[PDB]
């Protein structure tokens, strides 16, 4: 018993399935929210996130599944770029947020600002 999308085993006892929130609107819808105020791409914070395969298995990112062409989707509470708060307070909720193009990093010079960042079309 193996996932045909992420490969994970079904008898694997750490394995978990994704649980959406209600609000959960899909990516384009949520992006048009007033809770949000040098790129031609929006740039937001994002809390309480989960990453998963089409079949709904939580998935790591570093394992190179994106690089093996596997569509991974995500969900949580998008927040305002300036918003320091990691609670779901001033945020709108998204679901199945478009397949992950790239994932990146930054913070390798100055302070301990190692920020992990997802990229979507």
């Amino acid at each position: 018993p193996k996932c045909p999308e992420c490969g994970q085993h079904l008898d694997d006892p750490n394995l978990k399935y994704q649980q959406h929130p209600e609000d959960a609107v899909d990516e384009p819808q949520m992006l048009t929210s007033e809770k949000l105020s040098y790129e031609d791409s929006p740039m937001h914070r994002f809390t309480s996130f989960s990453v998963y395969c089409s079949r709904g298995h939580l998935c790591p990112v570093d394992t190179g599944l994106i690089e093996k062409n596997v569509e991974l989707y995500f969900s949580g509470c998008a927040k305002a770029i300036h918003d320091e708060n990691p609670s779901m307070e001033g945020g709108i909720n998204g679901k199945n947020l478009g397949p992950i193009n790239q994932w990146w990093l930054s913070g390798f010079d100055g302070g301990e600002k190692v920020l992990i960042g997802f990229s979507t079309a």
Binding site: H82, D83, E84, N85, P86
Partner: protein, 49 residues
């Protein structure tokens, strides 16, 4: 008056504030915005005596 309770010999440098600023003065040294980490709320580990 706002800073969360710690105990003798506290060593965790970065910790959550766990509460809003209470006095004027506090409001001024924390900034007119949110900041999660409270840095250097650490105190000496005094002898059991």
């Amino acid at each position: 008056s706002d800073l969360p309770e710690i105990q003798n010999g506290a060593s965790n440098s970065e910790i959550p504030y766990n509460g809003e600023p209470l006095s004027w003065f506090q409001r001024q040294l924390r900034g007119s915005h949110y900041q999660p980490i409270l840095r250097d709320h650490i105190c000496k580990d005094m002898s059991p005596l």
